[PDB]
């Protein structure tokens, strides 16, 4: 709500689309974040004036603790740089967490494996996997009440091809004539309130499923897709935000590869 300062930047072009090769807004008017759609300077100003704090959560159990060093090092270089960040590392090996040097205004909490905590420590929560690395900018352009990320393997696929759970006996069930996009179960976020709302719904749906002796085809991801179908995300991130260059290369439609799996 605080007034932005004078800023000098190119005037928006009303009669000139900001990307003519991709959809930049959903049918429910949520922006789809692609490179070229946002001016990061304006967005940085808006969020900094609000002294925004972003929590990044990851689970690293067993052999996965080995991915923490690169994950954290690259996050330090590309994730919410300039803003307050609180990393939450849930692990079964507290002593094995790498000693990574953090920039000012950034902290890390190791939780050995308390939800009200998030409500008082951060404004937004971003949930990802540890076996990844940031390769380019991932900033406040993604922040919104609730966001989902387009799966790199299905962004150009028809809904019939989406690997949603197709069995009516499952709570994650989505018929062939339904569905907007196929979202990643491993990269989502939003306000603490909305994220806890999504995880609480997923947890309940998965319990009902097991009680009925059924397990969704893609587990958590299947339920996340059911949730986002029925509760439209306020922002959708393009595949730039979770790519796999080994399996998909570098298409012209992707101007940047920001976050990827480690081969």
Residues belonging to the binding site are 59-61, 64, 129-131, 151, 163, 221, 244
Q: Which of 230, 157, 218, 145 is nearest to 188 (CA)?
A: 145
Closest residue to Hg ion using C-beta atoms? 202
User: One symbol per residue from 72 to 91: x for binding Hg ion (CB under 5 A), - otherwise; what is it?
Assistant: --------------------
**Footprint of Hg ion on 125-154 (CB under 5 A):** 125, 127
Binding-site members for Mn(2+) are: 129, 131
Minimal distance, residue 6 CB to Hg ion, in Å: 38
User: One symbol per residue from 197 to 236: x for binding Hg ion (CB under 5 A), - otherwise; what is it?
Assistant: ----xxx-xx-------------x--xx--x---------
Q: Quick one: which segment of 32-40, 107-115, 196-204, 228-236 binds Hg ion (CB under 5 A)?
A: 196-204
- Residue 184 sits at φ, ψ, to 5 deg, of -80, 135
Size of the site for Hg ion (CB under 5 A): 12
Please list, in sequence order, all residues whose beta carbon lies within 8 angstroms of the beta carbon of residue 50, skipping any fewer than 6 positions away. 2, 123
Surface-to-core class of residue 121, CB atoms within 10 Å of its CB (0-12 exposed, 13-18 middle, 19+ buried)? middle
The Cα 262–Cα 245 span in angstroms is 10
Q: Which of 171, 175, 166, 174 is nearest to 212 (CA)?
A: 171
Q: Quick one: which segment of 39-47, 92-100, 109-117, 118-126 binds Hg ion (CB under 5 A)?
A: 118-126
**Footprint of Hg ion on 36-75 (CB under 5 A):** 57
Of the candidates 133, 141, 165, 221, the residue annotated as catalytic is 221
The Cα 132–Cα 210 span in angstroms is 30
Minimal distance, residue 35 CB to Hg ion, in Å: 25
Query: What is the length of the chain?
Result: 263
The Cα 182–Cα 153 span in angstroms is 9
Q: Active-site residue 76, yes or no?
A: no
3-state SS class at 85: strand
Catalytic residues: 221
Residues that bind Hg ion (CB under 5 A): 57, 125, 127, 201-203, 205-206, 220, 223-224, 227
């Amino acid at each position: 709500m605080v007034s932005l300062p004078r800023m000098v930047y190119p005037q928006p072009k009303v009669l000139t689309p900001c990307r003519k090769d991709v959809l930049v807004v959903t049918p429910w008017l949520a922006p789809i974040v692609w490179e070229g759609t946002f001016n990061i300077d304006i967005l940085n100003e808006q969020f900094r004036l609000q002294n925004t704090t972003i929590g990044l959560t990851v689970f690293a159990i067993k052999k996965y603790v080995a991915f923490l060093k690169l994950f954290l090092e690259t996050a330090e270089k590309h994730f919410m740089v300039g803003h307050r960040v609180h990393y939450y590392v849930f692990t079964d090996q507290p002593a094995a967490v790498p000693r990574v040097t953090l920039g000012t205004g950034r902290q890390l909490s190791v939780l050995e494996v308390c939800e009200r905590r998030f409500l008082s420590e951060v404004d937004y929560l971003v949930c990802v996997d540890v076996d990844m690395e940031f390769r380019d900018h991932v900033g406040v352009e993604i922040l919104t009440p609730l966001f989902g990320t387009l799966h790199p393997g299905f962004y150009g696929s028809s809904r019939e091809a989406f690997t949603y759970e197709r069995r009516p006996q499952s709570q994650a069930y989505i018929p062939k004539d339904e569905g907007d996009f196929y979202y990643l179960g491993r990269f989502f976020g939003g306000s603490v309130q909305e994220v806890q709302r999504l995880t609480r719904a997923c947890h309940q749906a998965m319990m009902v499923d097991q009680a009925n002796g059924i397990e969704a085809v893609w587990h958590d991801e299947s339920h996340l897709n059911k949730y986002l179908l029925r509760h439209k995300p306020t922002k959708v991130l393009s595949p730039e935000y979770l790519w796999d260059q080994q399996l998909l290369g570098w298409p012209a439609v992707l101007r940047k590869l920001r976050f990827t799996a480690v081969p």
